[PDB]
Design a protein around this nucleic acid. Structure first.
Lengths: 83, 84
DNA sequence: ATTCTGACA
DNA sequence: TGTCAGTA
């Protein structure tokens, strides 16, 4: 689908992503290091997130607020990719 | 489908369940405190688990071993029960 | 013997 | 969660 390719185009910088998700750059990096999201990189090596990335990050923020731990986050996001 | 009635049928007590799921009574009862399971009761308030409860209990064990906490499991089971 | 609820040297 | 307690 042209949709999935659109939802995957990397274009969002860490700056807005932090404002919207309310996550620290540190946390964002952490979820990336755990394979939860996959932000490509520019020429300046700056991170560029995709819509699916930001969408998942908003979900991570939400699960955190509900008390879900890292293990939970992983299971859920994984079972979402399998849906 | 006279199977569901048999699966939702109270047959074994906490002690047998422990043997079928390798879960302690503390754990088994604890998951109940979180609304994860709804075991039927007898006249003596003794829990009688059905086949459905044991299955739903094996699921919890899998996640529990995966490091998922109660909040995580509530979140997971909540969806796995509304989709199918 | 077996399970139950509450509680924490 | 373990576990000891005091029952039912």
């Amino acid at each position: 689908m042209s949709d999935n390719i659109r939802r995957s185009m990397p274009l969002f910088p860490i700056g807005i992503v932090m404002q919207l998700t309310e996550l620290s750059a540190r946390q964002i990096r952490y979820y990336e290091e755990n394979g939860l999201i996959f932000p490509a990189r520019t020429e300046g090596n700056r991170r560029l997130f995709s819509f699916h990335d930001v969408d998942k990050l908003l979900e991570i923020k939400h699960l955190i607020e509900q008390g879900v731990n890292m293990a939970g986050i992983k299971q859920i996001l994984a079972k979402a990719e399998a849906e």
